[model samples]
Each structure stands twice: as C-alpha cells, then as structure tokens.
Target chain A: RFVDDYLPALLAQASQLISSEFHEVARQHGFSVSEWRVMASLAGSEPISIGQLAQVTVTKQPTVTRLLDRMEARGQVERLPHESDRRITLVRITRKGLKAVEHLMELAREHERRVLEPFGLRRAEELKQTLRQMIDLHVH
Target chain B: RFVDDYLPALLAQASQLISSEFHEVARQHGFSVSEWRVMASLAGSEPISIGQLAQVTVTKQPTVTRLLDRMEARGQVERLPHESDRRITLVRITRKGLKAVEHLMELAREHERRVLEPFGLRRAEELKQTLRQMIDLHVH
Candidate 1:
C-alpha cells in the first residue's frame, strides 16, 4: 500500500527522526525546538531581520519575538535596529551565543554523521543533492 | 558555511514546501494541517489507537484528542471500544472521511509528482532508499 511507501509520510518520518535526535541536545541546553531553530539560523552570525529570521526558523513572528526577548536579556543575542527601518529588528548572535552554537554545531555534526555515515560520503552528498533539488523546485 | 548546507534545514525546507502545497487543498476541504495528517494516515481504514494516531499525525495526544472530538462530532471518525479492553479506544475513519481522503490523495499525489519530477524516477527511488536507511539507522 502507498500508505507504507508514501513519499510525504517517508519524508515526515525521516525529518521527525532527525529532529528527535536533536531534541535531547536542545533540551539539555535549555532550549526548545523553536528556540534552537532560531539560534541555529542565527549561527550564520549574519544580521537577519525579524521576518527573515521567522522564515528560516519556520516560527511565527510573535513566537520569535518572545524567544528573542529572553535571548536578548541574557546577552546571548542582540537586536540591532535596521538602519533604514526603526520598526525592523535585525538580530545577530553575540559572542556568548556563538560559543553555545559552536559547541552544538559539533554535536550537530556528530548527529549528521550518524544519519549520513551509513551511506558513506558520496551517497550522502547525493541525498543532499536530491533534497536540494526538491527544495529549489519549491522555491521557484 | 554549514548553516546553508545543514541537513536539518534542507529536510525541514523540503518537507515544509511539500506540506505548503498540500495545505491549500486541505483548507479547501476545511481541514487543518494536523487534521489532514490524521485523516491521511487513517486512509488505510484500519483501526488505530490514540497514541498511534498521534505518532502518525506528529501531534501530541491532547491535541489529537481535541481534533478527534470535532471530527467525531462531524461524523468523519469514530471511537470504538477495544474488544478486550474497555479502556482502550480505537479509531476508525467513516465513509465520509474515506471519501475526503481519497479525493485529497489525488491532490497529494500530484504534489508529490511536482516534487519528484525534477529528479526523475530512478533518482527519486534512490532518494527514498537513502532516506529510509537514514530513518532506520536512527530508529535502531
């Protein structure tokens, strides 16, 4: 039955499994999935305005704002007013934020290894290539 | 940086895109995304328990229960007591639910086609195989 072989189900399960692996690490760091998502996207260390951050994190603007409030207070992240728009909040990972993310990046790589190592490097790259194509198709 | 190439981001974006396409059809049929997920999984017409339904829908038990309440009231689904355990509630989709799912399945298949068409069949199969391995390895 396609129920067992459905593409959407397969993709959803695969992603859920991956997220489950990261969930423990996120909680150990006192972060929720949404919080980690926001931080991980900010790990790019680039200044992303609220809307762009929300898009990448798959979080609502209000939710992102709530998370960022604690992060800003803790000095883990900073909100820089956009040069051109006072209403737009541009966010960047601070030194403290980078330290946390850097450590987690190592953990993330290990998790990625567990996911990809079974395929070896070449096949793993192919998997990424296929996923990239899927995403690019949607974007256009 | 790896941020742009992160596997989680790639998987999330790919799945999100596919879900977005399906969301419109779901809305047209007057179902939330969570409702659609439960209905899709129940399309097998097999009885499933609350926990199983939650796992399939990637929703928590409380949320699934809430949605199921409305669905049952609408005559789209039902809860039957397990043969041996009065405490165990089993859910089965009604004919009305099946009809809706069957129609949406067509739309879902079309969405899948658009997602995989760019990769062609052979590569798409390979992609699924790779994801299956990733999922299996994680599970074990």
Candidate 2:
C-alpha cells in the first residue's frame, strides 16, 4: 500500500525499473549513466549553464562541472562564455558527441516505445504530457 | 523532445522534481534522503531482505547494509535473521522508528495529494497505475 500510494517511492521505483535497463545498454556502449544523462539532456537544447545541466541531470553542480571537464577532454562537449553574460559559461554537445550517441539515442527511443507500448499510444502520450506538466510546474 | 519523449528522462525529471521538495522536508526532520527512503519502504510491509530493500530504495546493497547499521544503532530498524533461512537477513521498522516518522509520513501523503490535485483524482490515479504497471513489468 505504501508503494502504491506514496508518490515519491512509486515514482522512484518506476524510474529505476525503466532506467536501469537502458543504463546497462549505455554502459555496454561505453557511457556512464551520468554521461548518458548529460548527453541526452544536451541532445537538442541550446547551450545551458553548468547549474542548469546539474538540475536537469539530477546531479550536483560540482559533479556536473567535473564531468564536463572529462567530456571536454574527450571532445564530446564544449564550454563557451555566455553571449551576454561574461561570467556565465554554457555547455553544448559537439558534433562528434552527437554522432557518437546517435545510435544509442535511437536505441533509447526504441526502448521507450517498448516501455510505453502496453498503454497504447494515446495513453502513453498523455502520461508523458502529465509528467511534463508536473516538471514544468516544479522545475525552473 | 528528448526530455519529453524519453520515458526514463521524463520519469527521472518528474520524480526528482517532486521528491526533492519532500527530501528537503525530510532533512529538516533529521532524516537523510536514504534514511527516509528506507523507512518509507519498510512501512506497512513484511520484513524484507537487504537486497530487496536496496532494490526498492534504488540503493546499493552495501550502502543499504551500512545505513541499516547506523539506523539499527539509533533503534529505527532492526535486522533479523530470516526465518527458515540462515543466509538471508530481514529488516523491519521499529515502533520507535515508526513513531518518529509518522508525522513525516502524513506530511508526505499531504504532499502527494497536493501534487495530484491538478490532475483531478481520476487522472492522477491513472498516472499512478501506469507507473505501477511499468514497475511491475520490469521489477521482480
């Protein structure tokens, strides 16, 4: 009943169940879970600050910054000074990084499709929309 | 699109967004996030193995074991040798533990209710069902 009724526990359990499968695949393809998260967050977005990246990826800012350092060394990401804000740095995935993760991203899409298939496309989309609404309300 | 369409990312984002608020409250009450997770999992359930607790809480077994040691020291949980099995240990919440967390559990329920209010009861229940179905399918 606690598992059924507790939102945080239920959400956490569901997320872990679904994510761990893809995490294994990501690992086999040579990406740590955090690296995969960072890559996924950067996939289609404008360059974002380290703080924003940390928030989106559920990582600490220092850890995210450290990870960016490693990713930059590997040519997967680059940090640039913000266009209008001299003190702010923004990070973007590189062409090389996008190309490297393209296959994995496709695999992830297939994985998501499989996970949502049981609910039918309509229900699945609705579920995603609901989650997005919750995120938009809670996250800046 | 990646955040919206990727089920794992969406789930993680939503869960993190919701749970972090409760995590802050939990910390103010002198419970670490992991400790709160362990207590919540133990509530209203039969004693479970360390491995099972670790799985449900999304924690490593070693970490769970270590936390259990600290919790046991504080009389919040007790680990018992499994009945009819010498190899497995079972963990349960003590009355002391439950008493300590009772208010927080009530607070958590209120928090969940507030989160679900916008979706209306029917839609919120559906979302939770969908998440439970996903977890049931993937987790043993």
Candidate 3:
C-alpha cells in the first residue's frame, strides 16, 4: 500500500517533469510520447536492437515496432543490416533525424534550466540528490 | 555536457518513477492531481498561507487560489479567520474533506500494491532513492 503522504509531492513532480522536459515538448515536436522516447534513445545511441529498445522504453515490442515504423516512414530512422550480426536489426538515426533530435534536445534542456532557476543553487544540489533518492525509494 | 549516452537509462528511470502509485490511483476518487495535493497537505499539517501552498504545489498563486476556491465551494475546506496573524489566512480540512481523502488513499494504495507486485522491496527502495537523488542533482 502506498502512503497518502507523498501524493502531492509526487504529483507536483510528475506534472512539472512531463510538461517541462517530455510530454509537452514532444507535442510541440509533433511526436507522441512513445515516439519521442524512441527517437531520444536512437539519437543517443546507435546500433541498438528493438528488443533492447523495448526494455529501455518499458514499452512492449509490438508498440515499439509500430513506433519505429512510423519514425521510419517519417525518414527519421532506418533499420539496416548489422555489420557483424545478421540476426539483429540495427536501428540508426538519419541525418534529418539527428538534426531534429538536436533541436528538440535544445528546447528540452532550456526548459529544464528555466524550471530549475527559481530554486537558485542551494536547492539545485538537492534537486538531483532528492530525485535520485525518491526514484530509488518509490519507483522501483 | 550530459551524455546522450545514458539517455535510455534515464528514460527508463523516468518512466519507472513517474508511475507514481499513490497519486495516480488517488485521482480516480474525484480528487485530481491538484486537489489531492491540497487535501493531503491539510490532513496532518499546520494551516498554510496561499503563497506557501503555491510553493509546495509548484503552481501559480492565482492557479492555486482558483483550485482552493473550487474546493471551498465543494465544502471540503474552509478558510478560518486567523487570529492575530494579519496577513495569514488559516486553512483547514473539513470532515467531508478528510473522508474524501481517506477514500482515495485506500483505493490508491491497493492500486499501487498491484502495480508494484512484480518488483522487490529493495528495488522499490533503490528506485525511490534514485529519484530523490536525481531531483536533487537537477534542482541544485
């Protein structure tokens, strides 16, 4: 059973985070949350398998399969043959994909900075520490 | 520069922690993210100023004011005339408010337990800890 005590704090954290760094920004980028997650993962690292991608995104393989199809249709990514492993399909980001992702990253980070500025520095140190603590304690 | 290298790991963590057990299920009982926050704060704490509530909720003062106005209209809370504190408006939860909050708490805990059943207590503990740590690092 979850405690009632953490409701407000959690909700505030979720709303702020989703709006500032993820969901809202994804909307502006003309992508769904799942699409953004996949793009961000592919942009960050390449030659990753779809199965691994599902684990990373915590989304089902079928969902990711469709998400990638949509992204592929948009020319943001491509599934190509692996150099050494023919059994695995490697996902790679296209040049257009890289550019779009970089653009979104700029916006996401700027929004994050703006949201954190109100706390100044003292609170900044705790922001990371506390969030890490909460995630470990409550999110596993 | 933070590495895009850890982007997938971070995304996984975000999704895990953001699946907040208490608050999400609590909303099904008629208290939204905002109302649950205000009500929960009043459950056992001292009455707070509007500005203080805004700070806690991470909402605009006007926004919180409207939220509370809706609550007051619903008979869940009352702003008592504060004694000798010229600038403070004393807020308290009514019987109706506590009942509503308790009902949500019960349902929410049950929902969370179901969601968390697949994971171990240690993982849960660690995830919560990480979340708090991340927030501290970012906010600071």
Judged by DockQ, which candidate is best? 2
DockQ of candidate 1 against the true complex: 0.58
- In candidate 2, how many Å is residue B132 off? 0.8
Per residue, candidate 1 scores C-alpha lDDT tens digits across A1-140 of 44556677777778877888899997897777876787788886579899878766767789889999998998889988899978888998888888877777788878888777768888888888887777777752
lDDT of all predictions: 0.80, 0.89, 0.63
Select the stronger candidate by lDDT from 1 and 3: 1
Cα error of candidate 2 at position A4, Å: 3.0
Comparing 1 and 2 by TM-score, which wins? Answer: 2
Per-residue alpha-carbon lDDT of model 2 for A1-140, expressed as tens digits? 47556777878889988988898899999999999999988988889988889888988888999999999999999999999987789999999999988899999989988988889988898898998899889996
True-vs-predicted CA distance for residue A100, candidate 2, Å: 0.9
Report the C-alpha displacement of residue B115, candidate 1, in angstroms.
1.7
TM-score of 2: 0.95
lDDT of 2 by residue, B36-139 (tens): 99998898888999889998899989999999999999999999999998789999999999898888888999999999999998889889888878888998
Q: In order of the candidates, what TM-score does chain B achieve? A: 0.86, 0.95, 0.63
Q: Give lDDT: candidate 3, residue A116.
A: 53
Please rank every candidate by TM-score, starting with the best: 2, 1, 3
